[PDB]
Structure 1
Amino acid sequence: YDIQAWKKQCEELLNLIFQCEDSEPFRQPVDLLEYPDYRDIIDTPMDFATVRETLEAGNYESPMELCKDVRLIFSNSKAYTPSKRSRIYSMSLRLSAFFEEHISSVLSDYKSALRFHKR
């Protein structure tokens, strides 16, 4: 029932994501010389270094907020991809599945801890 445990759990999962080759494109921002229309399509860029920095700054209050930002990485990739068979989009879907598999217990444990706190 540790209300703070999610933060280290999210740090560890971000570490695992950074060790994944599939996270390569999503570790930093997109170069507009490489992808000059990217901000015409994507309103709110997001990447895993921004998520990690936000977490380490103490600027997430809950793992739900972190989860929303990570899901934005993946929805941006789906919005920007010209093809559902693109290399970078395909990397996003594997990484998304890995993320969702691991974040589910983090969310469940946090929400259970908050409920116990308010019992």
Structure 2
Amino acid sequence: SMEQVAMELRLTELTRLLRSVLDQLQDKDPARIFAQPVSLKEVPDYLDHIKHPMDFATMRKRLEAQGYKNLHEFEEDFDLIIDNCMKYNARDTVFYRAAVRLRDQGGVVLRQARREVDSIG
């Protein structure tokens, strides 16, 4: 149908907007602390602590599979990265501090993407 196509065009454009958002968020992690999944070889007990692991490479796989239907779903995954880190790591660590900074700095980017998604529909 012509409707399924128009829908596929919007999803593709949302995917394009979310790709730019992802790149902006990831620039706010220059140390690449959140770039890849926490290693289960190096933190064998991680899943006893954190039930829904997340990271930027895993979000990127989902993104490129057009697996995000809206900004809310994307934000949920970004919040997991931050929230997982702030539970697993203590306050006085480079990792916890890096999540606080990513959270504060990403908020500006997410604030405008919400307006752009509402705006362009």
TM-score (norm 1): 0.79
Q: Superposition pairs for residues 29-48 of structure 1, below 5 Å?
A: 29-48=37-56
Q: Is the Cα contact below 8 Å between 2:28 and 2:105 reproduced in 1?
A: no
Query: Which of 77, 98, 101 pairs up with 1:94?
Result: 101
> Number of paired residues?
112
Tell me what 1:117 maps to: none
SS at match of 2:84: helix
Deviates more, 1:54-63 or 1:105-114: 105-114
Query: Which of 100, 105, 108 pairs up with 2:112?
Result: 105
Gaps of 5+ in 2: 1-9
TM-score (norm 2): 0.78
Gaps of 5+ in 1: 115-119
Cα distance in 2 for partners of 1:62, 1:108 equals 13
Q: CA deviation at 1:89?
A: 1.1
Cα distance in 1 for partners of 2:31, 2:78 equals 11
Q: Superposition pairs for residues 17-32 of structure 1, below 5 Å?
A: 17-22=25-30, 24-32=32-40
Specify the code of the residue in structure 2 equivalent to 1:45: P
Greater RCO structure (CA 8 Å; 6+ sep): 1
Specify the code of the residue in structure 2 equivalent to 1:55: L
Structure 1 residues 86 and 57 mapped into 2: Cα distance closer, same or farther (>3 Å)? Answer: same
Specify the code of the residue in structure 1 equivalent to 2:74: L
Q: CA deviation at 1:3?
A: 8.3
Cα distance in 2 for partners of 1:45, 1:112 equals 32
Q: CA deviation at 1:111?
A: 3.0
SS at match of 2:25: helix
Specify the code of the residue in structure 2 equivalent to 1:52: R
Identity of aligned residues (%): 29
Deviates more, 1:2-11 or 1:27-36: 2-11
SS at match of 1:24: coil
Query: Which of 67, 75, 86 pairs up with 1:67?
Result: 75
Give runs of ≥4 in structure 1 deviating > 6 Å. none
